[PDB]
Amino acid sequence: DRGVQMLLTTVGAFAAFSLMTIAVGTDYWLYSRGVCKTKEEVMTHSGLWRTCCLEGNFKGLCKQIDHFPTAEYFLRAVRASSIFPILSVILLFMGGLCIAASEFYKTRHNIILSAGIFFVSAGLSNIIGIIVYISANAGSYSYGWSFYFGALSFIIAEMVGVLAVHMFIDRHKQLRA
């Protein structure tokens, strides 16, 4: 039905925003074997910003990752900053705002398209971020639940985008009726 599409779109947008924010915040991205804090080796959370000790002499201690020790330097810069994951969160937020303004100040019909473009772009930004992260780490291990929260954020966002575009298409079909 047409009335449920807006609910699905809005609830999806909220879910994607929340998942991406939690992932950018939490520290469970990579279960590695690292140093909990310097001045030997144990399992570590190693989230996006801070690597935190677990199963150790002092389990629980968390420190900031030392991103730095020319293409390699530029990658280090793009990874130390999380421009891509952060940009994904910003874009999802703006998409949500558009969906919300779909009703108030209605009949514009381009605000929905804007929502869709924002959701799809957030997805692309999320994938670029993941590739930068994985490439930056290397040069055993495992990926935590925040990394998969990020991935689920990408999938939900792409789906919400498809729904948005579908809604825009239907609105113009009605307008052309």
Binding site: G123, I130, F154, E158, G161, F168
Partner: protein
Amino acid sequence: PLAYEIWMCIVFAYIGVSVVLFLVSRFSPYEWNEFGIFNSLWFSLGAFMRQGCDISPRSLSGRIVGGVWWFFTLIIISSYTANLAAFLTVERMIESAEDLSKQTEIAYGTLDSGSTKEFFRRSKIAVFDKMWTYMRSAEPSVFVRTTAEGVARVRKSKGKYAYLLESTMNEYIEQR
């Protein structure tokens, strides 16, 4: 042949390429089979498996998306085949006493009172003389008191220990 993350990102990219092909192909109202979401997913899957198409994008934006997906597919599939071949080719190819004498990190010993220790002690070959110097100086005493002791020491040293002994006992052990 391809790492786990490569497969994961191939799937994420497939979803993204399909969604963008659908968006660019159908969002504009000034364009009203063609690529709906279902047909677009099919086009992308077929392209990755190099299995040809039933439709292809006709617009500039659609063709940009298609072109990059085609290039990505060529590099990834070629790399899968090349690395598989490297696995199989290489597969078709320390293992001596000198390699043991050279490696001092790995510890090797013999029975304390036996023809092996005497043979190394009275030897005149350089390799065996180097081995004898190592054993006579390798503290703690690499020497054992029984063959089964060396067997257990090797089986209980994370491969950091080697035992020199007569071949008949090894033949019996490998067979048991």
